[PDB]
Amino acid sequence: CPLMVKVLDAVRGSPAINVAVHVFRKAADDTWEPFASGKTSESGELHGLTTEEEFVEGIYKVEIDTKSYWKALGISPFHEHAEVVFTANDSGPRRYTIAALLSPYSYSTTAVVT
Amino acid sequence: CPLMVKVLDAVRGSPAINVAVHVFRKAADDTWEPFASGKTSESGELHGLTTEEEFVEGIYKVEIDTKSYWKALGISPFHEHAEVVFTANDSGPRRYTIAALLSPYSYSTTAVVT
Amino acid sequence: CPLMVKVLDAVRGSPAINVAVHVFRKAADDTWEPFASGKTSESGELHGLTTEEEFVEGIYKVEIDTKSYWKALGISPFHEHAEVVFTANDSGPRRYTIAALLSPYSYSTTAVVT
Amino acid sequence: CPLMVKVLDAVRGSPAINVAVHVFRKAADDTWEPFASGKTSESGELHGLTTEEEFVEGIYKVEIDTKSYWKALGISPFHEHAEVVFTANDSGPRRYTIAALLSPYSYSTTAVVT
Numbered sequence: 001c002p003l004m005v006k007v008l009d010a011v012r013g014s015p016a017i018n019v020a021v022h023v024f025r026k027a028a029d030d031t032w033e034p035f036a037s038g039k040t041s042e043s044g045e046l047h048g049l050t051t052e053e054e055f056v057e058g059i060y061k062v063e064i065d066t067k068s069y070w071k072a073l074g075i076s077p078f079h080e081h082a083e084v085v086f087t088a089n090d091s092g093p094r095r096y097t098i099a100a101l102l103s104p105y106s107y108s109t110t111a112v113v114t
Numbered sequence: 115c116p117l118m119v120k121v122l123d124a125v126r127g128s129p130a131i132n133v134a135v136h137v138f139r140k141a142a143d144d145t146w147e148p149f150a151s152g153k154t155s156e157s158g159e160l161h162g163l164t165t166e167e168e169f170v171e172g173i174y175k176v177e178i179d180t181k182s183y184w185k186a187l188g189i190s191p192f193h194e195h196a197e198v199v200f201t202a203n204d205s206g207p208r209r210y211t212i213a214a215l216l217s218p219y220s221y222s223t224t225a226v227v228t
Numbered sequence: 229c230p231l232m233v234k235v236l237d238a239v240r241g242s243p244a245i246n247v248a249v250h251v252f253r254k255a256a257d258d259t260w261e262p263f264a265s266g267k268t269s270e271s272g273e274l275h276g277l278t279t280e281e282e283f284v285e286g287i288y289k290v291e292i293d294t295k296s297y298w299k300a301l302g303i304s305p306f307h308e309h310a311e312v313v314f315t316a317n318d319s320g321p322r323r324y325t326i327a328a329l330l331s332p333y334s335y336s337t338t339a340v341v342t
Numbered sequence: 343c344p345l346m347v348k349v350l351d352a353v354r355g356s357p358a359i360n361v362a363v364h365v366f367r368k369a370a371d372d373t374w375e376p377f378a379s380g381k382t383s384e385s386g387e388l389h390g391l392t393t394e395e396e397f398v399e400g401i402y403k404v405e406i407d408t409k410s411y412w413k414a415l416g417i418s419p420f421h422e423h424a425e426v427v428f429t430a431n432d433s434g435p436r437r438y439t440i441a442a443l444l445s446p447y448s449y450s451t452t453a454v455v456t
């Protein structure tokens with residue numbers, strides 16, 4: 001899997017478990033087409049969203065449903081969700097780890113590309 | 115002004131000057147309508163995007179053109195841009211400061227609501 | 229004032245008010261000598277820690293009492309406190325803003341130097 | 343190993359490899375006694391610093407030599423190093439992952455405790 005998402009909880013000091021993640025790919029008409037989706041595991045990870053065959057060059061949007069996550073904790077979050085938009089494989093296939101660190105009013109995101 | 119954006123550069127240790135910021139508001143048909151735009155000042159700040167009369171409850175998207183910013187520095191960035199999506203004034207008018215700290219492969223964003 | 233500290237709360241989406249901040253300077257014998265201290269205001273800011281006459285080149289440590297801050301909110305924090313260690317004015321006097329964004333198990337810190 | 347350190351590079355979008363890490367434990371006389379040290383691997387990770395037998399309750403300081411790391415990249419960093427100070431095993435043995443995300447003028451740190 002060339003696309004992995006990892007999500008952490010900065011309030012509890014633990015992985016953000018069962019966070020919904022939706023991935024979209026920009027279509028020719030500049031629309032976001034659904035690409036893959038999943039929920040993070042107990043380790044706050046989501047693997048197996050794609051295959052390198054299917055993961056072609058393009059602009060992808062990784063949307064993390066942070067709102068639902070905090071609501072389930074009884075916390076009222078600021079953001080509707082966290083989005084990470086990036087061009088991928090523009091120079092051939094690469095492995096992308098998109099990480100997010102969550103707090104009710106803040107998130108940090110980083111990408112490790114190899 | 116009930117909405118202010120501040121953008122900092124984590125690589126140079128300075129405000130991110132002249133970063134284009136586009137603000138949209140979700141329309142009834144679930145589309146993003148253009149709302150306000152501008153460029154950050156020499157202090158990395160963007161004020162006067164709205165008025166509290168015009169700033170009604172709704173879901174707003176603040177889009178920060180980070181890609182152009184790094185390209186201008188000769189650095190190749192990961193993200194197409196940074197987006198902050200949030201519901202505003204759902205409980206009456208508030209002052210929102212949306213801050214972003216930028217790095218080529220990472221960004222952190224926080225909201226200070228008062 | 230050539231040294232300012234700003235502290236924000238990522239859980240409440242507000243400035244971190246009344247956070248104790250202690251600044252030290254490395255002495256010849258490699259010990260931390262007390263330099264300045266204070267508490268953040270209602271805006272999460274702490275100014276007037278020094279004067280540019282007194283603020284000479286050296287290694288300074290800004291210590292932020294985050295533990296007390298979270299305890300006062302009834303939250304159990306991970307860190308004893310946050311420390312920022314940096315060499316200052318090594319190239320003549322500059323204005324330093326040290327900012328920190330706090331969460332129970334995490335903190336981000338940036339410097340804006342001008 | 344109950345203590346793991348992971349360090350990432352926000353400028354290159356990769357793990358921060360070969361970063362020196364020194365861990366200290368607060369002694370009875372309130373002095374920092376050397377506890378363990380190592381360098382991060384190609385994956386930006388440092389494991390095997392201790393054993394759960396040796397990792398007793400106490401206040402520990404994890405110091406990350408960020409300055410040397412950036413200097414080797416020809417970048418001049420703001421911080422001397424990044425320090426993470428925390429009380430550990432105060433409620434019995436736990437596994438601690440201390441993560442840091444680095445930029446020349448900024449770092450973020452989080453702890454995942456299990």
Ligand SMILES: O=C(O)c1ccccc1Nc1cccc(C(F)(F)F)c1
Nearest residue numbers: 097099100101108109110441442443
């Ligand atoms: O901790 C992981 O295992 C991790 C994995 C991939 C990328 C980043 C990772 N950690 C981390 C540590 C601090 C801050 C952030 C960020 F906010 F950028 F997502 C991520």
Ligand SMILES: O=C(O)c1ccccc1Nc1cccc(C(F)(F)F)c1
Nearest residue numbers: 213214215222223224327328329338
């Ligand atoms: O530094 C400011 O003046 C600031 C203003 C409003 C909100 C946050 C601010 N500072 C700050 C300091 C560290 C990290 C971040 C964040 F990444 F969240 F944007 C923001």
